[PDB]
Amino acid sequence: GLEAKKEENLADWYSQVITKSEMIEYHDISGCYILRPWAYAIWEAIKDFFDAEIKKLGVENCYFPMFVSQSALEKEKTHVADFAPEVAWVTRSGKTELAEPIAIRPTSETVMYPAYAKWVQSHRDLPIKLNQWCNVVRWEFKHPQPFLRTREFLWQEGHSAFATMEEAAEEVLQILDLYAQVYEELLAIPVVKGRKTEKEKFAGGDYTTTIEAFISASGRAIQGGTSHHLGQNFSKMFEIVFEDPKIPGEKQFAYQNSWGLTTRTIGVMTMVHGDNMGLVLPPRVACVQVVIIPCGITNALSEEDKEALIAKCNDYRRRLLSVNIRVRADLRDNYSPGWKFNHWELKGVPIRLEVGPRDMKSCQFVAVRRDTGEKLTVAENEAETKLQAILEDIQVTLFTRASEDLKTHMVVANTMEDFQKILDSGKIVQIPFCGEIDCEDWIKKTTARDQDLEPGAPSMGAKSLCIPFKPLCELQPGAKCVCGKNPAKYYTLFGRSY
Amino acid sequence: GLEAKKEENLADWYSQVITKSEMIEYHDISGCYILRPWAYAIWEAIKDFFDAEIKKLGVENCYFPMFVSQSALEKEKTHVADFAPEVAWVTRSGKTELAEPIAIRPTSETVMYPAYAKWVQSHRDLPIKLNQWCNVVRWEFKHPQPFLRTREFLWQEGHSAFATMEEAAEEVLQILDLYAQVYEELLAIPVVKGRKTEKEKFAGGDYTTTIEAFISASGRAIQGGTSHHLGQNFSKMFEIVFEDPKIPGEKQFAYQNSWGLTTRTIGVMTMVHGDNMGLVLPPRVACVQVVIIPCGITNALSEEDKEALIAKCNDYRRRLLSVNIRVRADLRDNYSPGWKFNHWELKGVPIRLEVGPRDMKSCQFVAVRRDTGEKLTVAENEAETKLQAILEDIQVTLFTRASEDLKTHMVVANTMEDFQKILDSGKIVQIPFCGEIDCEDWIKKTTARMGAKSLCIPFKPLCELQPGAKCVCGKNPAKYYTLFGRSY
Ligand SMILES: NC(=O)c1nccnc1NCc1ccccc1Cl
Ligand SMILES: NC(=O)c1nccnc1NCc1ccccc1Cl
Ligand code: PRO
Ligand code: PRO
Ligand SMILES: [Sr+2]
Ligand SMILES: [Sr+2]
Ligand SMILES: [Zn+2]
Ligand SMILES: [Zn+2]
């Protein structure tokens, strides 16, 4: 079973959920974690849905080198400035020192865009739409946490280059909506589409959009994905240039975008839907949607009778495969049935299917929901339609409960004292914000200073999350920021973050 | 158009094929090459086949960290000794030096097996069958060539741990059989299944089974894949143990294998099937099997008739997509039909589908085979039937000629003199060999006066080693017929 309680101490609960579900194994290098097949299948499920959608947009998959030269990495000044201290450098091969240290990619902007310049000579070479699934390394100055914050992580990064800004801006929102579909339709997690502030925006871009998710156990929010508009800052440094047919003889710099989604998605799914019985898989991403377990195999049952009980389970397995239900039949005669119930509950299989000798003679079986523990006795001939209905209802309620949790935890506050008090209750707040960096740092410093949390809870100030595309309330004209010294530009979502 | 010719300068011909087919782009870090969509789509075709086959064997996909500690890397002494010079070491996080350098994986044995030991607590925990599709770094010191020998490459690496030795021995030959299917059933390249010698076997294992392919244009053979039996060399170092089911108090060490296939497959495909017209894709791994191109679009053609020809091309697109044939209609307005002819030829699309106004009105179209250049006028009715037949014809034609090239370039020699003659003729010779590492160093140094190195001990050699035959050196008796030759 599970020892820790998600409501009391969240860290060891998360640590026990990711291990006992066989998702995460630990490594002797801090910030690096093993993705076991149970977690990796979730990533493959996300990969299969996102690949199919970006190919509709004309995006193609490729793979670029992981090593970056010093000169390439420092073409964009403000970009390398933000990533320099967290870049891992290869300095030697074997015992021989490298003449020039090469870098491990924290992101592939400076690796790809030299090639973009070579590939783009005429206007016919645009647009370039490329994506790659790969690993990056970010030796960050933060507490590592599996899935959420790791030194090495798997992701997709898509880099598109266009002749006009209207083409680029269109794709930014197209991709961000795809990231929102990954969270809301696959992981059953609600997200808030928004724009990052000037402080938290991608270094080297004009603006960045993001989806923010909420983790109610810790009251903290987390970034689920970003779609940046790079404008021309990178094409001006890497010389991604073409001649426009309408503007004779003049150098045109391409408009570029980048967008990324990481294996953090798995950790958010764990933090939102996991309970005190272990992991909870949304049926959409569940590696196994239905696990079939033979029950009641006493020593008195004959060898022929036991084989007929196994055959009925395999028959349920074939029936569910013919209707595209991902089903595993745990026929292993080496483990107890209660060990199997516990094993697959920890892993989060949405439905457990129990077949016993009495039920098989009676033309029925038992279906047990993972999210609620509700046990239903279903007729043998209704197995294909009933289970698919339960699988759909599990996905709906997981998103319904997470949405109602989000609606009640994201509110509006206009003054600093109400923003402070609501923040200390475990909520994220939309406040009228002037949109300046020095004020955002002031909020980060004063929310941590005036904090009143539970005994033992560490000091953590609120930071910017996003400027929501559709905020909760309209900003009344002339309304000042929460600092009182500058006019407010927009409602900005704030709160403690991962 | 391609400037170089395969018969003259193979190096410059190869550099121009991979770039003009838009497979490879070059990078300012020596030995690292960009895999563009046309190349990566081949790797995906290899991946979806191979992944489907190992799932039937109970192998599951995962992903282990790229960084390995000094202590974990040096646990197996023979394994770390062979890889030590070619391991890249991270020593700096920005400008702050790590207290201890960490290494980029050249292979993931020392990364995964510490986790294998924690997972194997009893007999119930075996077998463990894990595979990952990832990048790996081996910092070579020889001149790099795209696909064939690169500083960083993509691969899959399977690691399996078994309770018995018969189990691991079964899987080693099962995986090698799948590698043979990848090269023969998909890439249409014949391979020679064999066994590495003591000098060439995987450091840290007991034996290595490999598939060796031959590049006829250069006369040098190349290793297509390997499946190693690690035995207990690693489980005795990383403490992967389990209680003896029969004897209480006695530990048993797991029997392990490892097996890998890299993106070198694409380069071997290029070097074998490519011609002076450019790349030649086998239809089974071809991203685009058929390209539809509208022809005869003159400036005087009526917009109605011009629109009718466009629709006719999309009608073939809908029909071919209905019979699971990968087809793209190149209806782009800013490129001439002749430009698209040479464009898809360079990339290796097996069949070109030409639709002109005269051929459309006569209910016909043209089919151009990439391998032979034959042009076939086909009626609109027998489209899905004949195009499917040509695609399978292209697949068997490419294999039959590469198998015929391998038959006439792999002969048997019996002494040092005649082995040198056939080797410098651009062929690989099977010779009676004593298996010693001493003679393997001598045969490479002598026949260079480059040089032929051990490739594999064929599972099925050409001639049966008659009893009494000694090695080509003369000192020791010959223990088996071995295939030698210059290799990449
Ligand atoms: N070190 C990290 O920030 C991290 N670690 C593990 C997983 N995701 C991480 N980042 C999240 C992220 C990064 C880039 C683009 C989009 C996103 Cl959502
Ligand atoms: N540096 C290289 O040797 C190399 N470079 C690119 C591609 N494959 C490479 N190795 C071949 C290889 C390696 C492991 C297992 C099987 C094989 Cl076939
Ligand atoms: O790292 C980032 O945030 C952007 C998005 C993917 C590519 N680079
Ligand atoms: O490098 C090799 O040859 C073995 C096989 C894959 C993993 N390691
Ligand atoms: Sr920084
Ligand atoms: Sr000019
Ligand atoms: Zn302010
Ligand atoms: Zn000898």
Residue numbers in the entry:
A (entry chain A): 1015 to 1512
B (entry chain B): 1015 to 1463, 1474 to 1512
Report text from the authors:
Human cytosolic prolyl-tRNA synthetase (HcProRS) catalyses the formation of the prolyl-tRNAPro, playing an important role in protein synthesis. Notably, glutamyl-prolyl-tRNA synthetase (EPRS) is a dual function enzyme that catalyses the formation of charged glutamyl-tRNA and prolyl-tRNA in the cytoplasm. The human ProRS (HcProRS) activity is located at the C-terminal region of this protein and inhibition of this enzyme has been recognized as a promising approach for treatment of HcProRS-related diseases. Inhibition of HcProRS activity has been shown to have potential benefits in the treatment of fibrosis, autoimmune diseases and cancer.
To further clarify the binding mechanism of the identified hits, we determined five co-crystal structures of HcProRS in complex with the corresponding compound and Pro at a resolution range of 2.2–2.7 Å. In the presence of the natural substrate Pro, the Tm of HcProRS increased by 4 °C. Normalized by this control, the presence of five of the 17 compounds, including 4h (R = 2-Cl) and 4j (R = 2-CF3), significantly improved the thermal stability of HcProRS resulting with ∆Tm values in a range of 2 to 7 °C suggesting these compounds are likely binding to HcProRS in a Pro-dependent manner. The EC50 values of 4h (R = 2-Cl) and 4j (R = 2-CF3) proved 6-fold better than R = 2-CH3 in compound 4d, indicating that the electron withdrawing properties might be beneficial for binding. Similar phenomenon was also observed for the 3.6-fold lower EC50 of double substituted compound 3b (R = 2-Cl) when compared with the single substituted 4h. Combined, the positive electrostatic potential of this binding pocket indicated that an electronegative substituent at ortho-position of the C3-amine benzyl ring is likely better than neutral or electron-deficient substituents. This is evidenced by the 7-fold better binding potency of 2-Cl and 2-CF3 substituted compound 4h and 4j compared with 2-CH3 substituted 4d and 2-fold lower EC50 of 3b (2-Cl) relative to 3c (2-CH3). However, in our ligand-bound structures, no electron density of equivalent water is observed, and the ortho-substituents (2-Cl, 2-CF3 and 2-CH3) of our compounds seem to replace this structured water. The similar stabilization of the benzyl ring was also detected for the other studied 2-substituted compounds 4d and 4h.
